[PDB]
Amino acid sequence: FSGLEAAIVLIAFVVVAAVFSYVMLGAGFFATQKSQEVTYSGMKQATSNLILDGM
């Protein structure tokens, strides 16, 4: 049994990690960038209120 083949796999473990890492970050930024949008809209929802002024 040789670690030469272990290397072959170790790539695969690392690569799928990096890809998941890659996407999760992308998934994550979008998560964040979405989380920001709802917040901006959220404040804009309340503060965009319009009012009847006087009689």
User: Measured in Å, how far apart are the chain's first and last C-alpha atoms?
Assistant: 91
Give me the 1-40 binding string for a second copy, x by CB under 8 A, dash otherwise. Answer: -x-x--xx-xx--xx-xx--xx-xx-xxx-xxxxx--xx-
Tell me: does residue 54 bind a second copy (CB under 8 A).
no
CA angle 44/50/55 to nearest 5° reads: 165
Residue 3: alpha-carbon gap to chain centroid: 36
Nearest approach, Cβ of residue 53 and a second copy (Å): 12
Quote the DSSP letter at residue 1. Answer: -
Residues near a second copy, by CB under 8 A: 2, 4, 7-8, 10-11, 14-15, 17-18, 21-22, 24-25, 27-29, 31-35, 38-39, 41-43, 45-46, 49, 51-52
